[PDB]
Design goal:
- 5 copies of one chain form a homopentamer.
- The first copy, chain A, is of the alpha+beta class.
- The first copy, chain A, folds into 2 domains: 190 residues, Distorted Sandwich (Acetylcholine Binding Protein, Chain: A), CATH 2.70.170; 117 residues, Methane Monooxygenase Hydroxylase, Chain G, domain 1, CATH 1.20.58.390.
- In chain A, 29% of the residues lie in helices and 32% in strands.
- Chain A has a 6-stranded mixed β-sheet, covered by helices on one side. In chain A, strands 4, 7, 9, 10 and 11 form a 5-stranded antiparallel β-sheet that branches.
- In chain A, helix 2 runs antiparallel to helix 3.
- The longest helix of chain A is centred in the C-terminal third of the chain and has 25 residues.
- Chain A is elongated and about 105 Å long.
- The two termini of chain A are 52 Å apart.
- Chains in contact: A-B, A-E, B-C, C-D, D-E.
- Chains B and C meet through helix 1, helix 3 and helix 4 of B and strand 1, strand 2, helix 1, strand 5 and strand 6 of C.
- Chains A, B, C, D, E: Homopentamer.
- Chains A, B, C, D, E: Its main location: membrane.
- Chains A, B, C, D, E: It is found in: Cell inner membrane.
- Chains A, B, C, D, E: Belongs to the ligand-gated ion channel (TC 1.A.9) family.
């Protein structure tokens, strides 16, 4: 049972695809195991870069293929290097850029909690053939969060585990318990942009929306809210074109709903005010004074959504 | 006639291309057939990964090309593996990411249901040389629908059949009946985003549009309905930028049409109400307040359109 | 002069790029010719896959390169195979996905019909070395046009002809007439989306535009028409965001022009009615009632554009 | 010093990227030079296609690398051909599609003149090793200009030159004078589309914007110009989402500015009319009659624009 | 410790990706070191391009892989060339196009200043085996600045250093010491475009916003500011679709925020102005004549947050 030691160097996590539940990771893979000792030129380890590795493999170098389980497509492989030691041990080193998949919940956008994950697993060798001895992951992390879209939180979770496959080939004495490396890197979304350029102005609109009740005439009151209705639509599109595409509503998506909700409510109140009547235009001088009702009523219903 | 057992593992279905009628599937293919016995090191099964597989083929190993019939372009191939047994049998294993083709009807968007299909067929060996003995497809699925764009519902449909080609080649008899595997996976669109962020608000717009008839003046009535016209267009663009490109109208596209009409309907009546006359101000002293007619009249036309 | 019979299978025609004048074609190529008789295993036809094809050619198998003349870039090739029969016979079969170019006039959008074209020609061998004996094209077409973007019409036109090149080496008897296969497939665009979601609402905009003359006050007359101007613009953008970009105007583009045209013309009259005068206030109360006058003048100008 | 005769065949120039200052060129390369005599089968020229070309090179055949100096990335190479003649001649022929880079000034869009340029230079061999004897360029196109976005006007510019590099590796006497082929093709943008669908309605926007002065009341003056401001804003995106991205302003970009200026200018004129007074109400009937001033006052600032 | 001299030729720096913090670099790498002398044909240096380089490496030529440390993914390499001199020295020459990574702060866009960085480091050999003697960088450009997006300042700053990794594998003495070349090019964004076409009109918008106070009735004042709110919103989408996507606000974003604030501020004043009381509505004589207070008050806060 070959003991293989692994090291992950995380260079960059970027390009989250919200609809695909996808992100990109640039970094290096380092794999190490000990084979039977051999002749090295001089006596210091021999280095084999890129092209020449396939010719070592053709003549019988055992370089087990380690597959990135949750990678979408096949990773862009940078330089590869084999360092063969005289005492026997062999180290595989290669840089990669890959597209990885993991469950990504984006509902409380833009205040996301996600975790970028790497899962590594031997393509052909089970726990009886190849096992992962240990793994440290290096997030060459620090500084400049305010410049970056994502703020990394942990220093990285690691687990070596055994995954068993029930539905196989026509093999089964115990050949079904492959050993797996799992890397987890926690992150929080940078909410500042969506706050000031989306949350705040949207807020001013909805608030300013309510000032429609400070109009004197019923006529002014009613046709005016049609322009404000027209405003939320323009705002929605502005948001729409910019926000990440998702199959569900975000918090922002919801503020927009409420905004529409504000105005349709206002239309009804304005109308109700007018034609509930004792003459012709007895605008009930109590509901003309839904001036403070609806604005503070919007705060209460806004606060029911928290639990 | 070589019997081949096939197994597809579906890892990810994503990337719907609404216009090209295409979807991308990440997964593994496993194909098994029995060849001539020959003797592997020790006598335990011996593994041939990626690069070395082709080197076996040069020395004459029969590794048949099984083509993805409905794949668009040629798929991203991950690691390949041959597991060669001494008793003869050979197992082909490979990971793929492929863009697949299938007829896709999007008229009832965002309530379309689709089925993602794989078609596999040996490229060159007909049913009398190579035939598909069986195929199982395992969709590693569960839970999290509320998070995903698509909801897979069946656990997968299977079809092994014979495809007959009437013309080619200059072979006569029946080297024309290649054996084909067809995998089918049903899905429903998560309509939640489009419900709350498109259906509901458009509904409120059309609804508040009807609020034009509570206006007292004719000028108010007529001018305000222009704002209503401008709003549906603004919403129309808002919609367009997000909705998928199609060559036919969707349900949402139709609500848009409904909106334009309602307002255009109102314009005509408001004009009609005020201008055929004995008067100047000839508001038929009670179409005035077709306040419940037309709103109710629009809903009736709505339930006929569901026919 | 080697006689080569070719057969094309068209699987999918899609992804027209309007600016580039290009479209994508997925299908299979088949080429057959007779060489010198050879010895196949047994006496059965020998089949050769992908990789192994070149190794046949490295020791001298003649496989002439047939170039897709009007292809943009070089095609994505799927599985390839050589079928070698003992009597001399050779069949080349390969799947391809290619981006092809042809002159595409898009002025009468969305009522354009285009023709998808394939041109195939030997890369190195002229009239006298390689000859196209014949070619059939199988358009595996049928049904459901209502779902697809393009409506394939013919059963595809075919023409084998001789193309002469004037600029050679200065080689002397008739070294210059490569033989060319030309496949033509006619198509018409599905206008259904654009009719109901673009033309129709645009018409309603233009129509409701004319209702400005049913306003009684001049302020309303002039002020309102600015709101209608704004509407045509909002409609223009919505349209632009969706429509294919071209270097010329489409029918829809022209309709947008008319909308701008309709309103600016109205503006002048509304002003003209008011201020060309015999007092200050005699609105020509008939040019006011140009109410249905240039609506049919607009219909006349629309119907004159066909001759 | 080897004489190399070159021929460029331009098939297609398309896909200009305004931001990268990039354009795509499809065509064939033809290179011919005289080597030491060879003895070919029979003795009429021997043809070597694609893959087998590398096998001749391994075998000591001199096929010099000619680099496309100004290509961005490395070209999609189609089929390659070696024609080896018995008298010594060697002709290299290949199809290519590449994105090329060149300086492109886009300030006066859409009335741009651009020139699509090709530069070819041997990658490794200087003028004293490899020299360009002559050069022909063949542009496979004519007619149908009003269908294409760029109108090729000239034929093809050509110049063989010697480029000297002062900063090399440090090789001393004269190994720094590589010979360079420069192909230039002049073209005009098809401005028709932008004239009819952008410039023209923009004019109608601006002109009708000025009609705000034929309004009677002061409130009418001011309020409407806000609708007019909103309209021009409205025009900008409609414009923005469609026009190519640049880092500097175009003709059109300025036209928009002018519209903004015009409206802002109007507001001021309009407020001023009302409030500089001999009473309060003295609308100076020359500044309210800037009905013709301000319109032709823009045309003056307008034709000084052109000079 | 082999001393290697490097030369970077920058041809073009383009296509910055703001979200990815990425830029594209087209150019050449030249690496030279001195080997043990050889025997070349005749005695003049022998040239080995592209394909035949791997065949020289197979026979034992030491061509060390120098990795672009901060390259995202793996670069498009053009032609490769080995120049082998008889005195021993070996020159690696090859063209590249790559996407590179570096921290890019875009907060003061469009007045950001950035710095393009290249990092090179041998992939397998530490300072004691391969050492960087020097590096020359050729920035082949100057002038033509108002047309270019970025204004280059330096002619490239460079610094060669020794990087040691704390977390290695099996090495004990001090062999953890790879030598790194760091290339820096300082740059300016040309802000003129965003000045005239985004800053200016946004400014005219905010300015005319203040003209709301030159309205006479309260209904016009309050009702008009609703249209102006809509204008800024309309401006926002305009802007955002065009401005580069970032995870933070730019200056321009903040100008937008200010517009909303200005208008929302105007709303409160106009209403506050109105229910002000000693009666029902006594218009406070000068607080509505903050017609010029608020604008220069906006100019004052405009100048304070700059500090």
């Amino acid at each position: 049972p070959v003991d293989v030691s692994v090291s992950i160097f995380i260079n960059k996590i970027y390009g989250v695809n919200t609809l695909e539940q996808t992100y990109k990771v640039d970094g290096y893979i380092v794999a190490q195991w000990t084979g039977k000792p051999r002749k090295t030129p001089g006596d210091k380890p021999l280095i084999v870069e890129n092209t020449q590795i396939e010719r070592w493999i053709n003549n019988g170098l055992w370089v087990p293929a380690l597959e990135f389980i949750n990678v979408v497509g096949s990773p862009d492989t940078g330089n590869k290097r084999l360092m063969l030691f005289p005492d026997g041990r062999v180290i595989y080193n290669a840089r990669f850029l890959g597209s990885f998949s993991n469950d990504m919940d984006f509902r409380l956008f833009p205040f996301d909690r996600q975790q970028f994950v790497l899962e590594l697993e031997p393509f052909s060798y089970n726990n009886q053939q190849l096992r992962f001895s240990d793994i440290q992951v290096y997030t060459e992390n620090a500084d400049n969060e305010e410049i970056d879209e994502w703020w990394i939180r942990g220093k990285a979770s690691t687990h070596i585990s055994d995954i068993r496959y029930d539905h196989l080939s026509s093999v089964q004495p115990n050949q079904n318990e492959f050993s797996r490396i799992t890397v987890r890197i926690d992150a929080v979304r940078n909410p500042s942009y969506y706050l000031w350029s989306f949350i705040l102005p949207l807020g001013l609109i909805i608030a300013a929306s309510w000032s429609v009740f400070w109009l004197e005439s019923f006529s002014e009151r009613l046709q005016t809210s049609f322009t404000l209705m027209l405003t939320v639509v323009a705002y929605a599109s502005y948001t729409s074109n910019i926000l990440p595409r998702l199959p569900y509503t975000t918090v922002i998506d919801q503020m927009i709903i409420a905004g529409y909700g504000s105005i349709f409510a206002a239309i009804l109140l304005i109308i109700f005010a007018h034609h509930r009547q004792a003459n012709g235009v007895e605008d009930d001088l109590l509901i003309q004074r839904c001036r403070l009702a609806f604005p503070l009523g919007f705060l209460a219903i806004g606060c029911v959504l928290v639990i």
